Amino acid sequence: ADKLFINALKKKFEESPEEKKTTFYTLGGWKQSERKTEFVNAGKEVAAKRGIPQYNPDIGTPLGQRVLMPYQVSTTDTYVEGDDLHFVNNAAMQQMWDDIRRTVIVGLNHAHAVIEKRLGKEVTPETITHYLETVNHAMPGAAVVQEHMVETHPALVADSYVKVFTGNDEIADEIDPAFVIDINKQFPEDQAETLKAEVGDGIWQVVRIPTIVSRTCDGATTSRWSAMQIGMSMISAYKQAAGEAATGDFAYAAKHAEVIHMGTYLPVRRARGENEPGGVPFGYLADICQSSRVNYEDPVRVSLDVVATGAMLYDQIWLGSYMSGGVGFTQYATAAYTDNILDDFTYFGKEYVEDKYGLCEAPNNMDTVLDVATEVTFYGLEQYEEYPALLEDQFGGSQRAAVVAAAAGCSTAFATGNAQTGLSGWYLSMYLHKEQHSRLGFYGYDLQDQCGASNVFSIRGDEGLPLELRGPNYPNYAMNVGHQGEYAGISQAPHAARGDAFVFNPLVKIAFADDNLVFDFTNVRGEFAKGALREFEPAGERALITPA
Amino acid sequence: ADKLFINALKKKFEESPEEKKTTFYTLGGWKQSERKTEFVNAGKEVAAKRGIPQYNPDIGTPLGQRVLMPYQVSTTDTYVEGDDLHFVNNAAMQQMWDDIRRTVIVGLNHAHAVIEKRLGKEVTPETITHYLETVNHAMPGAAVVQEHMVETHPALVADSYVKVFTGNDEIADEIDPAFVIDINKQFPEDQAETLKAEVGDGIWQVVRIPTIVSRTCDGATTSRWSAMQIGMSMISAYKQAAGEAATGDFAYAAKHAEVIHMGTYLPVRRARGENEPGGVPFGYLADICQSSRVNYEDPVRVSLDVVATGAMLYDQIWLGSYMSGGVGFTQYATAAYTDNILDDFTYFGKEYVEDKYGLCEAPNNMDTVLDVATEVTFYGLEQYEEYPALLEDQFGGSQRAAVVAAAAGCSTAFATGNAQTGLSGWYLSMYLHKEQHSRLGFYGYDLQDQCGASNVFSIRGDEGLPLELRGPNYPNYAMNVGHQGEYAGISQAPHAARGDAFVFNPLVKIAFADDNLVFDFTNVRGEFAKGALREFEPAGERALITPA
Amino acid sequence: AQYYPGTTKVAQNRRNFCNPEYELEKLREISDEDVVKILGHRAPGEEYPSVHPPLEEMDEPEDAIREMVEPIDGAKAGDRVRYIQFTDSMYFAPAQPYVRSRAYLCRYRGADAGTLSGRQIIETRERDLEKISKELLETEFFDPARSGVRGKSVHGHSLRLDEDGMMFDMLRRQIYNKDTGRVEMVKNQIGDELDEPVDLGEPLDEETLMEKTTIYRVDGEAYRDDVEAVEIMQRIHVLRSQGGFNL
Amino acid sequence: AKFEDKVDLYDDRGNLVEEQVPLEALSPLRNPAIKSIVQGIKRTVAVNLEGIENALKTAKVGGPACKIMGRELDLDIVGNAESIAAAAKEMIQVTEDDDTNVELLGGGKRALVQVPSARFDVAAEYSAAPLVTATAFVQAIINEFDVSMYDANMVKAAVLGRYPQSVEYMGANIATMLDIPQKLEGPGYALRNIMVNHVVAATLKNTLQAAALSTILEQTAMFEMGDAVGAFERMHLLGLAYQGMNADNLVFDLVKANGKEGTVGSVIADLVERALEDGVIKVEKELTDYKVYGTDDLAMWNAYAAAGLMAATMVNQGAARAAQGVSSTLLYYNDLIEFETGLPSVDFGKVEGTAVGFSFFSHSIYGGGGPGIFNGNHIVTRHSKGFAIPCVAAAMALDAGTQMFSPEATSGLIKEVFSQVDEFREPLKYVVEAAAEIKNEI
Amino acid sequence: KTAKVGGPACKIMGRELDLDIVGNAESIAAAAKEMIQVTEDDDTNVELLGGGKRALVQVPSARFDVAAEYSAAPLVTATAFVQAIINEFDVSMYDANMVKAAVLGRYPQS
Numbered sequence A, B: 001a002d003k004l005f006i007n008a009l010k011k012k013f014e015e016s017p018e019e020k021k022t023t024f025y026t027l028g029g030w031k032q033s034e035r036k037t038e039f040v041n042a043g044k045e046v047a048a049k050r051g052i053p054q055y056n057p058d059i060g061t062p063l064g065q066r067v068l069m070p071y072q073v074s075t076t077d078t079y080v081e082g083d084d085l086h087f088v089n090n091a092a093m094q095q096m097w098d099d100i101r102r103t104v105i106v107g108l109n110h111a112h113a114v115i116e117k118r119l120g121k122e123v124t125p126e127t128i129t130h131y132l133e134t135v136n137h138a139m140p141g142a143a144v145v146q147e148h149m150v151e152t153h154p155a156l157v158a159d160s161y162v163k164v165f166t167g168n169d170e171i172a173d174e175i176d177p178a179f180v181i182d183i184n185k186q187f188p189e190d191q192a193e194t195l196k197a198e199v200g201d202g203i204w205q206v207v208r209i210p211t212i213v214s215r216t217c218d219g220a221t222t223s224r225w226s227a228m229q230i231g232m233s234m235i236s237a238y239k240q241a242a243g244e245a246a247t248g249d250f251a252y253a254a255k256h257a258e259v260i261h262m263g264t265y266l267p268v269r270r271a272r273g274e275n276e277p278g279g280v281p282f283g284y285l286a287d288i289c290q291s292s293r294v295n296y297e298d299p300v301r302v303s304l305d306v307v308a309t310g311a312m313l314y315d316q317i318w319l320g321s322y323m324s325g326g327v328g329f330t331q332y333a334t335a336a337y338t339d340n341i342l343d344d345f346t347y348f349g350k351e352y353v354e355d356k357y358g359l360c361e362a363p364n365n366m367d368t369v370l371d372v373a374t375e376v377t378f379y380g381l382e383q384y385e386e387y388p389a390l391l392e393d394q395f396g397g398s399q400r401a402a403v404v405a406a407a408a409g410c411s412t413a414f415a416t417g418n419a420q421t422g423l424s425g426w427y428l429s430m431y432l433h434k435e436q437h438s439r440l441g442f443y444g445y446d447l448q449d450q451c452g453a454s455n456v457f458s459i460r461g462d463e464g465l466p467l468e469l470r471g472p473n474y475p476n477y478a479m480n481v482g483h484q485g486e487y488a489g490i491s492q493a494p495h496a497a498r499g500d501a502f503v504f505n506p507l508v509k510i511a512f513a514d515d516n517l518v519f520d521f522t523n524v525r526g527e528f529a530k531g532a533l534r535e536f537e538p539a540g541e542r543a544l545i546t547p548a
Numbered sequence C: 001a002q003y004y005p006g007t008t009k010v011a012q013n014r015r016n017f018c019n020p021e022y023e024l025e026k027l028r029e030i031s032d033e034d035v036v037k038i039l040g041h042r043a044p045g046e047e048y049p050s051v052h053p054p055l056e057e058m059d060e061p062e063d064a065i066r067e068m069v070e071p072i073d074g075a076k077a078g079d080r081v082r083y084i085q086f087t088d089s090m091y092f093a094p095a096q097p098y099v100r101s102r103a104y105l106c107r108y109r110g111a112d113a114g115t116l117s118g119r120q121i122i123e124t125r126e127r128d129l130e131k132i133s134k135e136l137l138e139t140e141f142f143d144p145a146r147s148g149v150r151g152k153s154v155h156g157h158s159l160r161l162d163e164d165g166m167m168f169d170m171l172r173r174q175i176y177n178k179d180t181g182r183v184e185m186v187k188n189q190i191g192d193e194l195d196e197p198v199d200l201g202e203p204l205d206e207e208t209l210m211e212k213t214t215i216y217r218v219d220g221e222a223y224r225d226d227v228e229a230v231e232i233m234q235r236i237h238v239l240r241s242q243g244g245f246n247l
Numbered sequence D: 001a002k003f004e005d006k007v008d009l010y011d012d013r014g015n016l017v018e019e020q021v022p023l024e025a026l027s028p029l030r031n032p033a034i035k036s037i038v039q040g041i042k043r044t045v046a047v048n049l050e051g052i053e054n055a056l057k058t059a060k061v062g063g064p065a066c067k068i069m070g071r072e073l074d075l076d077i078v079g080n081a082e083s084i085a086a087a088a089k090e091m092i093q094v095t096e097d098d099d100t101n102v103e104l105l106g107g108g109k110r111a112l113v114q115v116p117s118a119r120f121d122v123a124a125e126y127s128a129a130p131l132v133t134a135t136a137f138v139q140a141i142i143n144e145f146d147v148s149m150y151d152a153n154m155v156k157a158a159v160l161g162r163y164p165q166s167v168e169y170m171g172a173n174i175a176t177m178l179d180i181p182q183k184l185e186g187p188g189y190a191l192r193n194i195m196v197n198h199v200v201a202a203t204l205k206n207t208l209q210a211a212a213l214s215t216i217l218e219q220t221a222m223f224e225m226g227d228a229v230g231a232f233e234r235m236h237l238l239g240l241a242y243q244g245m246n247a248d249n250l251v252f253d254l255v256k257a258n259g260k261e262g263t264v265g266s267v268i269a270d271l272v273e274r275a276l277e278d279g280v281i282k283v284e285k286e287l288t289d290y291k292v293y294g295t296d297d298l299a300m301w302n303a304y305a306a307a308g309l310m311a312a313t314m315v316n317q318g319a320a321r322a323a324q325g326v327s328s329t330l331l332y333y334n335d336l337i338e339f340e341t342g343l344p345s346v347d348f349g350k351v352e353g354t355a356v357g358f359s360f361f362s363h364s365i366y367g368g369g370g371p372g373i374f375n376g377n378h379i380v381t382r383h384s385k386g387f388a389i390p391c392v393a394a395a396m397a398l399d400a401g402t403q404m405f406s407p408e409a410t411s412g413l414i415k416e417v418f419s420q421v422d423e424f425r426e427p428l429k430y431v432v433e434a435a436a437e438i439k440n441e442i
Numbered sequence E: 001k002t003a004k005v006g007g008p009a010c011k012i013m014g015r016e017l018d019l020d021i022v023g024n025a026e027s028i029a030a031a032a033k034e035m036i037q038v039t040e041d042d043d044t045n046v047e048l049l050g051g052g053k054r055a056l057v058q059v060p061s062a063r064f065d066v067a068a069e070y071s072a073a074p075l076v077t078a079t080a081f082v083q084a085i086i087n088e089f090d091v092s093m094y095d096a097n098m099v100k101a102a103v104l105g106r107y108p109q110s
């Protein structure tokens, strides 16, 4: 019956969502808001304590001449003021990033070959389990060889550990299950078969370093820290000299030859090492999100969970802090994961496709792009025109451009089963939207949008790439809000419609299928809500080593 | 009378410090230690809660077959186990790095020229004050122009603010004093006069972004976050259009033309952006440390406070985590700031120099290097030979090498008044030490040491540089413990002997003379002791937004 | 060759360890099997593992250097490269870390030597390692109280001695027998128990340790008092310094 | 005629080829064969056509373990290699008569490509080689099979990998000896960022040719970096000649005299004797039963000492047929020769220092690896200005199979393609010949 | 003369060196050109401008024919001028590192 966003609009405003007029200016300004009132009071306290003015509602212009709205976290019944979705104020969002940043995947295949071929020693499921006991003591920062070592406090580093996975069920069954990511438990049968076949007899470690270290340091720490403690545990468990020539082979394997970073390093203007947000390709972000293994009968839900994951990380933390800062970009991102708005538009498109072509059954060509992206764009824009409350909700043109094009591009990919025609549909949506309303986004929103159509199918050096391989360092995408997380969703979309177990890297997909993570990647939007309510318990806090 | 380290030796061991024999093996292993006992219990709790084994004292070899020693933090009466000096376990150490990482210095000279010449508006102390009130609301993450902004919680970002300084006393007096770092209050008269002359009529901002943000993100965030909120505050306070062509001049000034980063970006193998430890030159580190403005009649104390600053940051955090990780490098660093050992050797050397030459009165040549570095090296090494307890305390050759050569190098620079001959004395020390004991440090300790003599006075492209300009990215120095913090000390040494107000950048010196910092840079070793005792309260915690 | 400057007993002992024509004093007899046991790389009677085929089974490139340089026997056979590692007490052990690495590359072919403060290692092909290790264990390179064979957990070079005059060992590989005055090796170099301990003989007495040591100390012969040795080190510093600036 | 020095030049069998060659005839700035080698390394690319085909058929593109389900494309690339390569060459070349070379290898599985010199004459650097080659092959494949607009982006990913999302060509199926300019440790370092294994591969494990190629690259970089300008030029030239080109047969003769039974220390003794015999060093002072040596020509002493260092490596690592100990030889050759003589070691301690760190980072947990993964641009091994890495190349050439990360493991594509180029495979021959040809122009 | 080397607002007190470089620009430039050129009368150019306050330098083409890239230009120029200034005033080994810092800055730390 109702569009999916109607309940949220009725919560925000006294008027029915269709009504065109309202009342302004008599709401009390900031005084209408519980959260702004909290902030006013805290600012006075802070300024007095430190002897320097801080938050003051009388500086600049007076917030709250209109309704300061609640937001529904999409797929939840949780309604919060938008400040509770700012990454600074939301521990769930900070932990989501920490859990990615502090992860690396490191093979044991080369390592086991060094042991067998260079050292002449045996590797068995028993020696692997012994090694895994050893590395789970050492990885958080504790000693195995030298006398008079000082160590990290176990409780400060409780979130760091090492697990393994392999496609060989019989071998997996022989390793203590405390250390194993069980692919057959975590994934539905057809997905498990695909993932096991991709891994084969390879054995891979998923290493998580301590959040407290990641926060003190940076993402490029992760693979170094991992390798040091892998190295020590190989010495201890396999009876090497503690520092012989073979020890260097384990180092080079763990740091270079068999490591999978979450993010690659960035060029000098935006200089950063590995495991920073800009290095994480869109296909990896889709695979980090675990919606695919729990919501696989609903491709829209899978795709929009990916969009939530990426809009928060890429717009709020990455573009809104690493690349800028200040108040930042909360609502540029919340547009993609609140009020069930993107959900309504994308369900529309999925239904359109299902009825016309069947999922994955449309021709992979421009005719399909023109059909589906145009239809879905016109639907979404019509909703802003029919529901003035919707338009006042997603008040910035950029937000609207992102949401409408995300639906258009995901729907096109649902039709073709191919992310590249989904991307073409995203750009067509932009062009149509711009002409319809004689506006699109902010001053710089459509840099990538105007380069977009020509670069979708280019094959040139710094232009051509399948969408799955693109990321925040693809040149056209390196600067602007309201695109990156949506592109992760479009990358996910054809794979979700196809029922594929992963989008770009099966190892990354399996690595986040782990109940010992702090953040729950199977329910990203639920976790955002939990953090907004101040109900999420992050790792990395220093309470144990500070005064009461 | 007694050597300065005698009391610490007598606290550690039952035997007199000169006794050659002891008793091992019957101490209970880890059970002798309160801290290790805490860790064993915590590891049981962690493993039980998460379902994966973690800290276990019986993995590997059994710690505590010898005495697990307390360490005296030098210049204090505080004795702690070494684990309490691990940066993970020490909130003072973490906050020291955060306070550096989250700081940038940003001129207002170009900005004020844009206002006067391009906008045609006046800049006065009153307009500067109004801008400072505005940017102290905005910088922590709060809005000044747009409607319907969501903001950071003021109490989470209470540590973020902007101050200014200028060499012009009369202008400084006209800006509201809540915002001014008062050079005449913070520095002794002669130092103040030097600093004011270097700054002149220039007006500089010291910007500190939120510790919670620095921890979530990275160092390269700092100057961006800074610039965004400077930009907003220039719009609000000087009545620009909110985004006109002139707005871009302010951006470029704050991000490029008049910014001073703490650290410069690093090459790809060790890829990192600005404001990471490897980018911080040794002369900046000396200037960050504030011992110079409080302990200026004691050049030893000033130099060794800089060594403590640098040994912790460069060895424990940078080399021991950013560049490696795991248990890391606590004791490679503590050797330089515990038990009053380095202090004994360096006071010896300063006394030798004062009596033979007078401080800063020796010829700046190789004769003075040979004399002073040889004498001080032989004194330090004799102490290890005369006191078996001292040798068992600084048990690793690298520790001894760094301590003895730091005393030799600082003393040579106290004689010459020039950091370069100090550096030559450091290398000579290493060569003598190696021949005396037929050992020096760990496998890779003297890479830089053997290149060292030849590269002190070289002028070639990637070889030649005054020591003050060198840092952790100088090629020879990029990898190894036991040198970088000591080099910061040697860079400080001649300037402390001379009475100079700064070593390499007067703006950096002034920027850390600020009582609103969290960490007390005037008493680095006292702060490390406070953190070891679990008495330091850091910024950046999330207690307010998590369950109680 | 002259090896090392200086006029002390220490300097002469450093020269003697380097000089392959100097016959090292043999202090103890150790069986072939017991060398294998201490090393811990293979069991007595186990065939040597290989890392590549024998050189006569491979087609090498035509190469005058290969023709001129005779491979050691373990290279001909394709043996693993394995190690032996020693720790030397600063309380007057006969050999010390740099003295070992310098001597090893004067005396032994095909050697990878590494020096650290608390450990010193040689790596070479396994069957050649066994031959070298006999000499390292039986001669004045080794004292069973002041030196230890240790492939891990090396702490002790800088520690006080125990009541028997033995260096600390976290893993207690070498045990002094109060009833004989002799030391037994009870574990291999990585710390695994031996079936049957190996007799290492009596520790050297204080006078003999002083005669044989290669460490300089104030309570023996101090380095600062070997003025010719010091002069040469200072000369090298000065010449390196000048050379880096100009020639 | 800047310098008076002359050297005698030999071949890799120890036979005299040309006597009395002016030192500057071996300079990178003068010698036309060094120019040819450097310009050849800038312009040569290996193409793995089999790899491109397999990446496309499986949709395994963009880096380790990566795959895009549903994107597979089954194209007969190897079977149509002659047509594809000819089409690529038409795009690569500037004119029909230029120095473009495109040669199929391995029945069409591989191609050797040398992009024309004219492209580099109007380029800032060397990345035109991989980038022109990659787009020519991408376009030739697309045109061969009429790959659609919708699918052609997969061909691009199979050829050049995840670039430009990654800074490097991550997952590419092309290779060069050089690496991208962003990875330089300093300006002027590009000729140093050539893995030792790649040099050993290109030279087919011929020890003296590997040493020569490495020395030519390292010393040529020293010119680009400005290290070999003014005061230090002669020192660098003499090091190229004596360490890398077997000048005066000094390396070869030291090896011959010490190869049957010798050690590092016996090589040192022979080198010191030879330097005394030749008047390069002389007794300066007598201590107590100890001779202090001096010299009036530090650059020549350094060159003699560097020849000895190379011979010590060949003797020590040659005897083991195992490369790992090169880090030890580089350390203790230098440590021992300073206490033998009272004179500074090679590169005034910088070889010794490089060797300390190299030893650590080839025997520890912290980084590095085996000898073959190092190079003059590696943070561990950049410190000596050309005097250390050529010994590492000699040692890896002599390794009989002890290394996990061997040239077979790291450098197979490089081996197949770059060893085809005569001046890369046998550079000593060409440099000696060119020096002889220009001897009267100096 | 001010010891202001190594980046914005940087200074090393006690390291000042009072050298009349502009007054001796012709000698210094000639000496630098001898090091920059490969052969006499090649395409090296070194031209003083602004009364000796500035110099135009064109590093010989032969250096780039055997180079990977273009950094030989600043690096060769910098070292030639460093060496020429040291030689002009007989700057001591102890002080010459300041000349290097004045020409090329904080490289290689930056």
Ligand code: F43
Pocket (backbone or CB within 6 Å): A138, A142, A143, A144, A145, A146, A147, A149, A150, A228, A229, A232, A235, A242, A243, B325, B326, B327, B328, B329, B330, B331, B332, B333, B395, B396, B397, B398, B399, B440, B441, B442, B443, C116, C117, C118, C119, C151, C152, C153, C154, C155, C156, C157, C158, D363, D364, D365, D366
């Ligand atoms: C396995 C290695 C080789 C390698 O790459 N790194 C090691 C081990 C590593 C581990 C040891 C942790 C553990 O026991 O699990 C850590 C803590 C680095 C990490 N992964 O966190 C470390 N070394 Ni080490 N390492 C040290 C040291 C040293 C000294 C110890 C000599 C002695 O007589 O005890 C020697 C080098 C030397 O001989 O000079 C040394 C060797 C070694 N170092 C030998 C093991 C030695 C042994 O078998 O006992 N370290 C030191 O000299 C003091 C500082 C100390 C470091 C920890 C701290 O700073 O608190 C630690 C620093």
Ligand SMILES: C[C@@H](OP(=O)(O)O)[C@H](NC(=O)CCCCCCS)C(=O)O
Pocket (backbone or CB within 6 Å): A224, A255, B269, B270, B319, B320, B323, B324, B444, B478, B479, B480, B481, D361, D366, D367, D368, D369, D379, D380
């Ligand atoms: C050498 C290099 O490692 P790679 O050879 O590149 O793996 C480098 N590590 C280090 O320099 C480690 C320094 C800290 C640990 C050793 C301290 S002595 C780095 O990770 O970039």
Ligand SMILES: O=S(=O)(O)CCS
Pocket (backbone or CB within 6 Å): A442, A443, A444, B243
């Ligand atoms: O107004 S601008 O488009 O420049 C910035 C939008 S946040």
Ligand SMILES: O=S(=O)(O)CCS
Pocket (backbone or CB within 6 Å): A243, B442, B443, B444, C116, D360, D363, D364, D365
């Ligand atoms: O033993 S090593 O010198 O490699 C490492 C010392 S922490």
Ligand SMILES: [Cl-]
Pocket (backbone or CB within 6 Å): C247, D231, D234, D235, D299
């Ligand atoms: Cl010369």
Ligand SMILES: [Mg+2]
Pocket (backbone or CB within 6 Å): A014, A015, A016
């Ligand atoms: Mg109503």
Ligand SMILES: [Mg+2]
Pocket (backbone or CB within 6 Å): A015, A019, A021, A022
């Ligand atoms: Mg109404």
Ligand SMILES: [Mg+2]
Pocket (backbone or CB within 6 Å): A122, A123, A124
């Ligand atoms: Mg096995």
Ligand SMILES: [Mg+2]
Pocket (backbone or CB within 6 Å): A177, A178, B051
């Ligand atoms: Mg479990």
Ligand SMILES: [Mg+2]
Pocket (backbone or CB within 6 Å): A176, A178
């Ligand atoms: Mg269990």
Ligand SMILES: [Mg+2]
Pocket (backbone or CB within 6 Å): B174
């Ligand atoms: Mg007034």
Ligand SMILES: [Mg+2]
Pocket (backbone or CB within 6 Å): B351, B352, B355
């Ligand atoms: Mg006195």
Ligand SMILES: [Mg+2]
Pocket (backbone or CB within 6 Å): C029, C030, C031, C032
């Ligand atoms: Mg016998």
Ligand SMILES: [Mg+2]
Pocket (backbone or CB within 6 Å): C031, C033, C034, C196
């Ligand atoms: Mg027996």
Ligand SMILES: [Mg+2]
Pocket (backbone or CB within 6 Å): C062
């Ligand atoms: Mg031949």
Ligand SMILES: [Mg+2]
Pocket (backbone or CB within 6 Å): D079
């Ligand atoms: Mg066919």
